[PDB]
Amino acid sequence: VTAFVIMTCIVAAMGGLLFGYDLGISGGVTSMEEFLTKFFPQVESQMKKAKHDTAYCKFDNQMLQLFTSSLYLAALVASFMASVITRKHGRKVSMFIGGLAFLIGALFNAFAVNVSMLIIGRLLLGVGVGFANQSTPVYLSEMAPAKIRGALNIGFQMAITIGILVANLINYGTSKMAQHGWRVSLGLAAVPAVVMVIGSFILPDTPNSMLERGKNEEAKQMLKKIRGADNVDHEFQDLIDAVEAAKKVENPWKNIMESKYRPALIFCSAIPFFQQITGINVIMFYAPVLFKTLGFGDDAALMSAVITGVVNMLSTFVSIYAVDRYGRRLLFLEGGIQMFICQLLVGSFIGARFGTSGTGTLTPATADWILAFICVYVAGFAWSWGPLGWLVPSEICPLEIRPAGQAINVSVNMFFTFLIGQFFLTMLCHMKFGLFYFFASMVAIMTVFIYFLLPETKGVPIEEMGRVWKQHWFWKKYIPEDAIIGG
Numbered sequence: 394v395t396a397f398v399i400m401t402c403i404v405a406a407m408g409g410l411l412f413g414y415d416l417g418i419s420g421g422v423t424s425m426e427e428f429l430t431k432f433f434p435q436v437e438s439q440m441k442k443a444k445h446d447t448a449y450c451k452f453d454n455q456m457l458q459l460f461t462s463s464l465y466l467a468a469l470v471a472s473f474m475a476s477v478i479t480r481k482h483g484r485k486v487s488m489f490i491g492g493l494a495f496l497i498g499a500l501f502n503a504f505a506v507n508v509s510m511l512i513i514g515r516l517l518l519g520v521g522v523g524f525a526n527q528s529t530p531v532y533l534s535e536m537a538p539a540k541i542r543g544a545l546n547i548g549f550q551m552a553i554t555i556g557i558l559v560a561n562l563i564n565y566g567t568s569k570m571a572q573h574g575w576r577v578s579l580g581l582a583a584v585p586a587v588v589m590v591i592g593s594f595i596l597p598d599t600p601n602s603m604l605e606r607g608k609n610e611e612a613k614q615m616l617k618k619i620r621g622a623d624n625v626d627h628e629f630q631d632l633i634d635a636v637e638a639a640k641k642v643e644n645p646w647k648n649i650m651e652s653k654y655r656p657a658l659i660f661c662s663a664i665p666f667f668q669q670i671t672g673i674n675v676i677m678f679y680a681p682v683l684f685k686t687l688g689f690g691d692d693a694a695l696m697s698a699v700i701t702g703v704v705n706m707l708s709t710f711v712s713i714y715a716v717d718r719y720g721r722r723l724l725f726l727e728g729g730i731q732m733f734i735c736q737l738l739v740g741s742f743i744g745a746r747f748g749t750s751g752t753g754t755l756t757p758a759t760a761d762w763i764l765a766f767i768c769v770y771v772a773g774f775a776w777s778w779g780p781l782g783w784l785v786p787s788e789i790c791p792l793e794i795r796p797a798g799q800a801i802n803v804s805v806n807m808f809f810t811f812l813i814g815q816f817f818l819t820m821l822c823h824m825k826f827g828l829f830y831f832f833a834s835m836v837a838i839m840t841v842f843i844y845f846l847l848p849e850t851k852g853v854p855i856e857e858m859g860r861v862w863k864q865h866w867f868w869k870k871y872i873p874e875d876a877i878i879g880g
């Protein structure tokens with residue numbers, strides 16, 4: 394491990410900020426009266442008569458769901474495009490496109506003068522997210538020394554949570570603007586894109602992609618540079634071995650369903666789905682809706698998005714320290730147990746305080762204990778399914794289908810991000826605390842799934858990952874002998 398490989402992965406992980414900024418900023422902007430009046434005067438015309446509501450709760454009308462989904466549709470579709478680009482031209486090439494498309498969408502939003510620029514900036518933001526999220530995890534996983542691959546991979550997620558936090562702070566400040574606050578909120582999304590774009594000019598590409606697309610001596614020089622050694626023959630042989638197999642495959646989507654890829658295929662699909670049916674993107678807004686409904690500051694709701702975002706970042710550090718010293722399984726099991734227990738605690742706490750005879754017992758101290766319970770649940774997510782949701786699919790895919798496997802990860806995730814968060818929109822807004830129990834069972838299901846089916850992937854060089862599957866009960870019947878590289 395060199396100072397060069399470290400700085401390279403830090404600079405590449407900054408692509409998480411794009412997704413993170415957008416996740417953090419859109420809740421505040423949508424509550425801004427000046428922004429609603431411009432683009433959705435029908436929402437404003439009933440926010441005017443609500444006072445105790447949250448505006449994004451009325452994005453339940455058919456045309457409003459269209460506008461919301463368009464970003465996830467664009468990202469879902471970009472991510473497949475980026476599978477092809479990333480393999481054909483290299484990982485740093487999809488990262489460039491991700492930033493540049495995100496930049497273009499940011500200025501379109503910040504300078505929108507009607508609802509068609511907003512759509513167009515929203516389509517573009519999602520293209521940015523499909524490319525950034527499809528290729529940055531691949532880049533990190535392949536560039537990092539195997540010893541610390543998980544730590545340097547999670548920096549992508551660390552960046553996502555920094556994006557979430559920073560956006561929430563921005564919204565808090567621009568919300569106290571006489572005019573154009575929403576333009577600042579959307580417009581500052583352009584700083585991370587410029588950073589990502591400029592960065593992509595300076596990053597090297599992975600020797601894995603370099604060797605796979607013909608640049609041989611260039612691949613070994615880059616391996617010797619990031620590893621800092623001259624005797625890279627050993628792991629360069631793993632690369633030679635894998636490119637030998639991978640260069641027999643063109644159109645990885647043709648062979649994706651072959652038996653030797655079944656483990657990676659299953660997990661590239663279930664891990665994104667599970668990450669969302671956790672309910673993280675429903676539960677993260679229970680407290681601000683609740684706070685606003687029951688009186689309490691408009692500020693108070695935004696203040697609790699900051700507190701959660703401070704907890705959501707920072708918790709990330711736990712996964713970063715633990716993931717390579719003790720593994721992925723530990724974080725998956727502990728994180729799920731913790732998340733399971735907070736969901737039962739908060740579901741029943743609400744169900745008690747506001748349910749015996751009648752309904753309606755507003756309380757400050759009761760509101761803070763629900764936020765503490767959610768924060769511990771968000772912490773358990775933040776060092777399990779959060780980061781592990783962008784680490785594990787990237788590190789279980791043989792070279793020829795790695796980019797395609799990351800695209801399955803992004804597309805399934807965006808599809809379910811939108812689907813779960815829109816389906817649960819009504820219950821979240823009408824304070825149906827039964828959702829915490831439902832999300833409890835899913836966390837139970839997914840924790841059991843993980844326990845039995847996911848082998849430990851820590852410490853293994855990326856191209857040797859088939860030995861791990863072969864040494865797992867159950868999955869071992871899928872992996873042919875010729876798929877085990879380096880031992």
Ligand SMILES: CCCCCCCC/C=C/CCCCCCCC(=O)OC[C@H](O)CO
Pocket residue numbers: 399402403406407410541544545546547548549551552555559713
């Ligand atoms: C109020 C304005 C504030 C503006 C805020 C600007 C945000 C800066 C971006 C940071 C990307 C962070 C991602 C880097 C994650 C690095 C952690 C890591 O990857 O691990 C290191 C490894 O363990 C070593 O041994």
Ligand SMILES: CCCCCCCC/C=C/CCCCCCCC(=O)OC[C@H](O)CO
Pocket residue numbers: 503504506573576577580581583584587
């Ligand atoms: C490395 C740094 C890169 C720099 C990244 C750029 C920063 C983006 C900020 C954008 C804010 C846009 C503010 C525009 C607000 C003026 C809008 C206006 O005045 O128009 C009113 C409208 O027409 C009424 O109908």
Ligand SMILES: CCCCCCCC/C=C/CCCCCCCC(=O)OC[C@H](O)CO
Pocket residue numbers: 700704707708710711714761764765766768769772
């Ligand atoms: C080596 C790695 C170091 C590990 C670093 C880990 C840092 C994670 C911190 C988590 C805080 C979770 C506790 C949740 C805080 C509750 C906040 C709250 O309840 O807010 C109420 C507020 O007062 C209403 O107004």
Ligand SMILES: CCCCCCCC/C=C\CCCCCCCC(=O)OC[C@H](O)CO
Pocket residue numbers: 433456457459460462463464466467468470471474508512516520
């Ligand atoms: C080019 C690389 C891949 C690009 C992938 C593109 C695929 C997604 C396309 C459209 C998403 C849906 C867009 C439809 C948006 C309609 C918005 C709207 O109708 O807003 C109404 C407003 O509320 C007034 O009432």
Ligand SMILES: CCCCCCCC/C=C\CCCCCCCC(=O)OC[C@H](O)CO
Pocket residue numbers: 727731734735758761762765766769
């Ligand atoms: C990985 C190491 C294993 C560690 C396992 C930890 C699991 C914790 C489970 C439930 C905590 C629920 C209790 C949350 C404590 C919140 C304290 C708090 O601050 O709430 C007080 C409130 O702010 C005043 O009104």
Ligand SMILES: OC[C@H]1O[C@@H](O)[C@H](O)[C@@H](O)[C@@H]1O
Pocket residue numbers: 416550553554557668673674705778779780782783810
């Ligand atoms: O930190 C919170 C975020 O973590 C990411 O890993 C997930 O993909 C996001 O949906 C989530 O909102």
